[PDB]
Enzyme design. Structure first.
Site, PDB file in Angstrom:
ATOM      1  N   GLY A   1      77.307  37.909  54.247  1.00 21.28           N
ATOM      2  CA  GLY A   1      77.144  36.476  54.196  1.00 21.28           C
ATOM      3  C   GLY A   1      75.748  35.998  54.528  1.00 21.28           C
ATOM      4  O   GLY A   1      75.492  34.791  54.454  1.00 21.28           O
TER       5      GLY A   1
ATOM      6  N   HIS B   1      72.185  36.797  42.591  1.00 19.98           N
ATOM      7  CA  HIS B   1      73.403  37.584  42.710  1.00 19.98           C
ATOM      8  C   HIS B   1      74.633  36.731  43.015  1.00 19.98           C
ATOM      9  O   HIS B   1      75.752  37.238  42.904  1.00 19.98           O
ATOM     10  CB  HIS B   1      73.161  38.647  43.781  1.00 19.98           C
ATOM     11  CG  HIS B   1      74.315  39.562  44.024  1.00 19.98           C
ATOM     12  ND1 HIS B   1      74.442  40.782  43.393  1.00 19.98           N
ATOM     13  CD2 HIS B   1      75.354  39.472  44.887  1.00 19.98           C
ATOM     14  CE1 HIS B   1      75.534  41.386  43.830  1.00 19.98           C
ATOM     15  NE2 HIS B   1      76.103  40.614  44.740  1.00 19.98           N
TER      16      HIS B   1
ATOM     17  N   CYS C   1      72.983  36.787  52.904  1.00 19.71           N
ATOM     18  CA  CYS C   1      72.144  36.638  51.720  1.00 19.71           C
ATOM     19  C   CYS C   1      71.574  35.230  51.642  1.00 19.71           C
ATOM     20  O   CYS C   1      72.280  34.246  51.873  1.00 19.71           O
ATOM     21  CB  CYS C   1      72.949  36.911  50.452  1.00 19.71           C
ATOM     22  SG  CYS C   1      73.468  38.614  50.186  1.00 19.71           S
TER      23      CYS C   1
HETATM   24  C1  LIG Z   1      73.014  38.481  48.388  1.00 23.77           C
HETATM   25  O1  LIG Z   1      71.708  38.272  48.929  1.00 23.77           O
HETATM   26  C2  LIG Z   1      72.883  39.655  47.480  1.00 23.77           C
HETATM   27  C3  LIG Z   1      71.789  39.807  46.627  1.00 23.77           C
HETATM   28  C4  LIG Z   1      71.681  40.928  45.799  1.00 23.77           C
HETATM   29  C5  LIG Z   1      72.675  41.904  45.825  1.00 23.77           C
HETATM   30  C6  LIG Z   1      73.761  41.739  46.686  1.00 23.77           C
HETATM   31  N1  LIG Z   1      74.863  42.476  46.940  1.00 23.77           N
HETATM   32  C7  LIG Z   1      75.649  41.873  47.885  1.00 23.77           C
HETATM   33  C8  LIG Z   1      75.068  40.689  48.294  1.00 23.77           C
HETATM   34  C9  LIG Z   1      73.869  40.629  47.511  1.00 23.77           C
END
Ligand SMILES: *[C@@H](O)c1cccc2[nH]ccc12
Ligand SMILES: *[C@@H](O)c1cccc2[nH]ccc12
Lengths: 306, 306
Positions: free
Chosen positions: A143, A41, A145
């Site tokens: 943040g 993503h 992720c």
């Molecule tokens: C960040 O991990 C991530 C992964 C998939 C979808 C999504 N939407 C916002 C951050 C994010």
């Protein structure tokens, strides 16, 4: 004595965390040998975040579009590819802090440690379980992720989780380190939701054994029950069925406490039917289900790692 | 979102843990620069463990009596001395992993992370608070003596606790890193016991604010109360008094949620007087008091460390 939610020491994972930036999206990556792993993503923009075709999005990228920073030192990306829902960035430098590791996928009901990170800098560590509905009850802000979950066995780090997103009830969804999601979730904008959960019965029994080891005995009784009769009660209260393998796994704790597994089932039956009547077990007024039999044995018996 | 008992990343402390053996006693030491710090009880034998004169016991020792091992590498002790209840061993090698650090002493009501260790090898990490009665509700088995508690601020480790012993109720006592005990406890065999505790009121209020930030609102009400009237209720239920400084410290959380501090006090009053009536707050059926206002702000707002 005592009993705490205990995470693994996080040092071996701290030395792998890096920051990955692409466009105006910054998140965390995991640097092992000469590959950085991160959620795919990262290549998405806000309009892309509706029904993205990631193969199209990725062919439009150059290595130089990916800014990777290990501390305050920049890493040169020399290749990129996609695996399921993760991205793999080859960098020109192998991480000299790479621990011995494995990529393992865990089962609902199992626990792991999470190293929450922001901008590639570790923030805190805590223990989670994979829920029966394949979500985790984490603690994550924007943040985070790319933060990972893991277990450690002697000197080897088994990575089992990469964080991707928050669902509308505030619980969390992510992938294994091969990029395959836990549960029926996708990395695109939908109305997706957790859906119904259950309580992890074998873990509750393990925690009652932890309590007896630690001196809480008020919930014990002379009664016993059959496995079928217990499972009829578990079903009413939305607990998951107890199998003979669960009974077998609880053998060591049963033998240490002298309390037959089916006797402890009779105690749990009474607790579900009567509540706790104002008392506590291991400092909780609820029946706790996020400790496995293994977790209880490590903490009430005492193994370390190197 | 979410809210977990979150410890600091432990890597900076893992690199300081060593094993100290003297006679047939093995415990943990903390290696910073060219000094290893450990509980002075390491020089004690089982008969010594009744009313020891540590000055006599120590003058009878040689440097070569102290076996110090950092991983599988032995450290040469070249000097030794006693400071209050800790021992200071000079070794011939400065720890190349020494972080920036401070020795700080904390207040009852404050929290810290604990890196439980055995044989100088880290086992797990968890969060604790210093109780009003100067004990901590830890998780420790034999061999955990010398494990330390700490906080991290940017890149600097503030060590605040060294573990010494378990009291008869299963809670734990230890010293600051100057060797001065927290509370009225001694490192000799007595009938010493914890003695009466109270609930940390300002921390409970901080946690209710965490809950509102995270969507739990059922306990809110239109009522308000005065500070004196709240404190009369706190005293009945064995909560510690709330001061104007506590109110001031809760200002940022109050301003973020739009809930006046004295209004949240009225909510706590109702919860003490009515119980929870079968509902939960942040996954707990009890009022939680081991999160400080700072802990809530780090986790619901999101600061990291390097
Ligand atoms: C960040 O991990 C991530 C992964 C998939 C979808 C999504 N939407 C916002 C951050 C994010
Ligand atoms: C080890 O921390 C220690 C310190 C004081 C007293 C005592 N008794 C058994 C272990 C121990």
């Amino acid at each position: 004595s005592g009993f705490r939610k205990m995470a693994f020491p996080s040092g071996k994972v701290e030395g792998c965390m890096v920051q990955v930036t692409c466009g105006t999206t910054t998140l965390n990556g995991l640097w092992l040998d000469d590959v950085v792993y991160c959620p795919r993503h990262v290549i998405c923009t806000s309009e892309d975040m509706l029904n993205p075709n990631y193969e199209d999005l990725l062919i439009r990228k150059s290595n130089h579009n990916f800014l990777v920073q290990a501390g305050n030192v920049q890493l040169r990306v020399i290749g990129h590819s996609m695996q399921n829902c993760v991205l793999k960035l080859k960098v020109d430098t192998a991480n000299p802090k790479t621990p011995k590791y494995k990529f393992v996928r865990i089962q609902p009901g199992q626990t792991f440690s999470v190293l929450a990170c922001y901008n590639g800098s570790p923030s805190g560590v805590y223990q989670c379980a994979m829920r029966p509905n394949f979500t985790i009850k984490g603690s994550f802000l924007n943040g985070s992720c790319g933060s990972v979950g893991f277990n450690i066995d002697y000197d080897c780090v088994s990575f089992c989780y990469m964080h991707h997103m928050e669902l509308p009830t505030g619980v969390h969804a992510g992938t294994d380190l091969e990029g395959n999601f836990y549960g029926p979730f996708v990395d695109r904008q939908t109305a997706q939701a957790a859906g119904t959960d259950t309580t992890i019965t074998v873990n509750v029994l393990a925690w009652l054994y932890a309590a007896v080891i630690n001196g809480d005995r008020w919930f014990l009784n002379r009664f016993t029950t059959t496995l079928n009769d217990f499972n009829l009660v578990a079903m009413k209260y939305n607990y998951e069925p107890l199998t003979q393998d669960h009974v077998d796994i609880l053998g060591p704790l049963s033998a240490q406490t002298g309390i037959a597994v089916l006797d402890m089932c009779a105690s749990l039956k009474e607790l579900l039917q009567n509540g706790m009547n104002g008392r506590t077990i291991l400092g909780s007024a609820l029946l706790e289900d996020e400790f496995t039999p293994f977790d209880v044995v490590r903490q009430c018996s005492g193994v370390t790692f190197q």
